[PDB]
From a paper:
The membrane domain of the mycobacterial ATP synthase is embedded in the IPM, with the catalytic F1-domain of the enzyme extending into the bacterial cytoplasm and attached to the membrane domain by a central stalk and a peripheral stalk (PS). As do other ATP synthases in eubacteria, chloroplasts, and mitochondria, the enzyme couples a proton-motive force (pmf) across the IPM generated by respiration to the synthesis in the F1-domain of the enzyme of ATP from adenosine diphosphate (ADP) and phosphate by a mechanical rotary mechanism. The mycobacterial rotor consists of a membrane-bound ring of nine c-subunits, attached to an elongated central stalk, made of single copies of the γ- and ε-subunits. The mycobacterial PS is made of two proteins, bδ and b′.
Protons cross the membrane via two half-channels at the interface between the rotating ring and the relatively static stator component of the ATP synthase, and they provide the energy from the pmf required to generate the turning of the rotor. In the mycobacterial enzyme, this inverted L-shaped half-channel is clearly present, but the water molecules that form the Grotthuss chain were not resolved. The mycobacterial inlet channel in the a-subunit contains the polar residues aHis12, aHis15, aHis16, aAsp30, aAsn104, aGln112, aAsp117, aGlu122, aLys125, aGln192, aLys219, aAsp222, and aGln229, which are probably involved in the coordination of the water molecules that form the Grotthuss chain. The proton inlet pathway then passes through a small aperture between α-helices aH5 and aH6 formed by residues aGly196 and aAsp222 into the interface between the a-subunit and the c-ring. As in the bovine and other ATP synthases, the outlet channel is more open and funnel-shaped. In S2 (where there are no resolved substates) the c-ring has traveled two c-monomers further round (ca.120°), and in state 3 substates S3a to S3c have all traveled on to approximately the same position, four c-monomers (or ca. 280°) further on. Similar to the prior study, the electron density maps for each of states S1 to S3 has density for both tethered and untethered forms, and hence those particle classes contain enzymes that are auto-inhibited and others that are not inhibited by this mechanism. In the tethered forms the mycobacterial-specific extensions of the α-subunit make contact with the γ-subunit. In the first element described before, residues 520 to 548 extend from the C-terminal region of α-subunits and provide a “hook” which catches into a “loop” provided by residues 212 to 220 in the lower globular domain of the γ-subunit, thereby tethering the stator and rotor together and inhibiting rotation.
Author numbering:
A (entry chain H): 3 to 9, 16 to 81, 86 to 96, 104 to 120
B (entry chain M), C (entry chain L), D (entry chain N), E (entry chain T), F (entry chain O), G (entry chain S), ...: 3 to 86
K (entry chain b): 22 to 84
L (entry chain C): 538 to 545
M (entry chain d): 1 to 61
N (entry chain G): 52 to 69, 207 to 212, 220 to 237
O (entry chain a): 10 to 247
Write the structure that this text describes.
Amino acid sequence: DLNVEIVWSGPATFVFTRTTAGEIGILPRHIPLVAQLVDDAMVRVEREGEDDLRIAVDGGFLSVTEETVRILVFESEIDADAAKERTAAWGRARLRALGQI
Amino acid sequence: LDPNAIITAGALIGGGLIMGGGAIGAGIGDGIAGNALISGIARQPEAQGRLFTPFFITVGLVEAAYFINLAFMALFVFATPGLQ
Amino acid sequence: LDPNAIITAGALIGGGLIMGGGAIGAGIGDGIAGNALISGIARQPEAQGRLFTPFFITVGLVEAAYFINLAFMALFVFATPGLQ
Amino acid sequence: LDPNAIITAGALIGGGLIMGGGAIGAGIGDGIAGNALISGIARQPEAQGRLFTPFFITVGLVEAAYFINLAFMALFVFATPGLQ
Amino acid sequence: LDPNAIITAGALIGGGLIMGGGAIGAGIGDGIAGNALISGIARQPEAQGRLFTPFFITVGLVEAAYFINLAFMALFVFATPGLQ
Amino acid sequence: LDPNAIITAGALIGGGLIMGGGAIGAGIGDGIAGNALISGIARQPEAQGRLFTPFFITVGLVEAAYFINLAFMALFVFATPGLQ
Amino acid sequence: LDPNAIITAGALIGGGLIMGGGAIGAGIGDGIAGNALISGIARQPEAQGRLFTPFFITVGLVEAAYFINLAFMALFVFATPGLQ
Amino acid sequence: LDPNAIITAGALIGGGLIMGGGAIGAGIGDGIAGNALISGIARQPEAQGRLFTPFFITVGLVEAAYFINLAFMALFVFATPGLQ
Amino acid sequence: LDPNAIITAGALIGGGLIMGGGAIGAGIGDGIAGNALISGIARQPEAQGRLFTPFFITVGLVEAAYFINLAFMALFVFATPGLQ
Amino acid sequence: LDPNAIITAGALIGGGLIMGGGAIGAGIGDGIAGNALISGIARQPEAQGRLFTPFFITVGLVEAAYFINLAFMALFVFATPGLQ
Amino acid sequence: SNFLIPNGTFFAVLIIFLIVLGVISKWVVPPISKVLAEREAMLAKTAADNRKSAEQVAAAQAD
Amino acid sequence: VKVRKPAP
Amino acid sequence: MSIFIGQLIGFAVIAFIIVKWVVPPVRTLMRNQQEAVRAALAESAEAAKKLADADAMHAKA
Amino acid sequence: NMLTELAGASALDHPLLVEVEYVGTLYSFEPDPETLFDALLP
Amino acid sequence: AIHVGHHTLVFELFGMTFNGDTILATAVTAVIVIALAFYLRAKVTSTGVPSGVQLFWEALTIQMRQQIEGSIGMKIAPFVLPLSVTIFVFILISNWLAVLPLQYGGADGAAAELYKAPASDINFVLALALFVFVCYHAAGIWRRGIVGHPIKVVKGHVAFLAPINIVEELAKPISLALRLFGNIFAGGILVALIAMFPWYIQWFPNAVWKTFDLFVGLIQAFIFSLLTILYFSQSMEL
């Protein structure tokens, strides 16, 4: 497992997101990395036998270290009705997080 | 010795060269274009539909040469120029 | 000597060239496409599924050349055109 | 052996080499240029309109090198130089 | 000039060409796929396992062609088409 | 056997080799340079104006190598050295 | 002309082609795999231990093909099929 | 027949091979070096002055080989070793 | 016509093919390995020493084949198999 | 027919093959190494001198093969092994 | 003789293919499309029923 | 802006 | 007949490989899909029952 | 921290940047480090 | 003795030759496909647990519908789905029926196959490829009109490359056929070549090649289906 820290924090098994270069998935021993999340980036965290956390992010920055994955920015606290330039990006972020896409 | 035999052997060798060169070119070019397409899809899932339009354009050109070669190869082995 | 012997030797050499070119093209194109696929999977493992579709679109577009060559190669060696 | 037959066989082999080389060059160069175009469109979806200009220039060179060869092959095969 | 001698010489040359092309294609394709595999394992060591799924598929599509050439080279040098 | 026939066949084969190699080099080099140009323009559109300077140099160093060979093929085919 | 002489010349040419193709494939594939390994080690000094397992596999697949060619080349030049 | 005919045909074929290899190498190497130069200038416009010195070191090497080949080809075709 | 003359011509052509393929493979593989080494040293100043470990392996694999081929070329050209 | 003529033609073809392969390898390997050098200097201007240490090594190795081929080509064309 | 030359078999094979296509068009794909559409509609109805139960269990207490 | 490199 | 015997042995090997390493995984996928659709059907039935119960409770209240 | 790592790898020519301080396995930057530095320094 | 070609059961009719072996193989494949289809028609259930045959058929339909949706709207081209699925199943069954042990010795030392994959015959591949060719060209005629369609295919995505475009349009059918042909034709030879080994050595290479040929046939059916769908999409746009 790898310690994910959204700045939520805790162990996880997989971390999916979408940077400027493209979609990236991080596993426990990924190489050190520094990337910029896309404007409407969505971060999915898969834990050992728990529901995946689908966080919406604005102006994020991913940093993978030998120990932890730190995201420098949830679907439960998002309303679809209000979710439907940067304003468009944030709306798209909520849409992606919810699952409407 | 039959002149037609020599001409036909030369035509067969030339057609083989044409088709082998076309094969190399088509295979490597298509592999390269497909590598580009696969990377683009892996990095931008929604980009797939947008990527086919340029991709196949490339393939078109890459295919053209090959089949053009094929055509000439036929002319070498089925209607051999200079054959008596 | 026998015209058919010369023609058959030429046909064998031409078919060898055809198959050599086809093998080079197929091997290198398949390697490049597999490189794209493997890099895409390593970058983001869960994309594997959606990558297998374009990959086989690439592989086919490559393999065609090779196998097309193969067909013609058979035509060279098994039913030699212009074999007196 | 009729000298014309030897000259024609040599011309056919030479033209086959010409077209094989042209096919290899055209296929691989077009594949590489198309890889560049596809990657650019993948990273910059709005860049398509501006990319087609340089891309074709590349093709305009590659294809040229191919078609020039296609011309000379014809000269080799249809009007064979030195054909006594 | 026993015709079978010319047939066998041409068949040996064709088989040599077939193996040359097959070896080039197999070696380069395997090297490229291995480059992708090594880069992926370096980037994501924990994805190693599943990364073998595409790699072998690529190695399946490359080596196959090689051995296919093998099957056709043996033919050329053991059951020569058109042999007299 | 007319010596001029053998010499002309050899000259045609040599010229075919010359132009095949020239076409391979020109096509692949132009493709690679165009790939660099296309990627550079895609990354930053404003770079276009300044990018055509090195590009034309690269193509200049590629096409030249082609055209020289082309000229030499003429020597081989039209005024064959040592034609006897 | 001794049939064995022509057959042996063809066998030597075929074995030369076999080694040429094997050499090209082995050298280029090993170079590419080593490029991947060197890049991986440069990025991670401690990844070396885990990077030899895939690298060797790649070197296992490439070299094997080359060595297979070697065997057949011996067969071509030491127990020539079709010799008499 | 005249031995000079066979020797001259062989020399022409060898010179054609030399030019084919030289052109392939020169074109592809110049393309690769120019790709590096174009990418470097695109990323760092100010680097245009600094990048030329390595580039000319690369091209200078590449062209060297090509021109050396040319010299030897001039030896093969105009003053054929072993001519008689 | 002396049979040994034909056998020696075939052996010379085969050895030339052996050395040409070996040279292509060695040159391109060393170029690729050196590209990796130069990039790695550029990215990390202190990495130089350690990087020479995998590098020497890659070159060791690339040169081995080459030199092995060289050996066999000698066998072709100095102790010709099947030569009477 | 003079056997020395056949041997000389074979030696000329073999030497042409050797030089063609050597030139291809040298050109492409030097291009790749120079691409690495130019890229490294573009990223790290401070490394303008450092990178020349590995670079030469790489070039050395590449050039080595080339010149070795050249040497053997001389032995092929000037002191042909097998004249009789 | 050449195996690459077409034959009358080209017609015969075509005919067979055609009838197979007909079957697949008239007894495979329409039923399968209907089944898939019904399954998707059932999933949508399940979601709607869950939401309606959730809102009724609240409204009843409210009213 | 801290930089973890020696001064030039 | 000899080549027939060899080919039959080869086919036996093929069938052994298929049953050993191909049948189990595909059977597992078939079971997974069957159980997923069965669970969907059960979910729909229990959701209909839940809506009926909610309607009954609302009418009572 | 991330800014320090990007500054080390990236050329120090950002207009906003021009202060700078110097003190005595690498980090991979998914795009070029220059773009990340430009987008992060603000 | 390898006996390339040499179709058996050949018969004449209406002044045309017919390769009886390929007709029989195609008929067997069609019978298998129709039997599967009818076995489905008697087991389709939208309310119960689907049978394995229903799972297979619906997996094929879902994959092909997904491909169409990605390329061109289903409402735009509903007819493409049945064509793609039938092509896929036909080619897959034809290729996979060769795994069965129908190869024997013809008493001359040359192997003879009781069942040979029909795609190893130029007529079969030509039939499929030309039918698909006419189908998507007629679909393009309907979509863009009788006059517009040829104009658009000649112009292509970029008008000034009209010559190449023409070649491309001729390359689509041929590449569709020959590719498949080769893929199967190669097998039809390799097994025959493997027949020259003694049984105690023949068993192993034959097993390896047939196991790989299973994947080859699956991949070839998949590629043919996707390429047909994509050509339909290219021919039906704007």
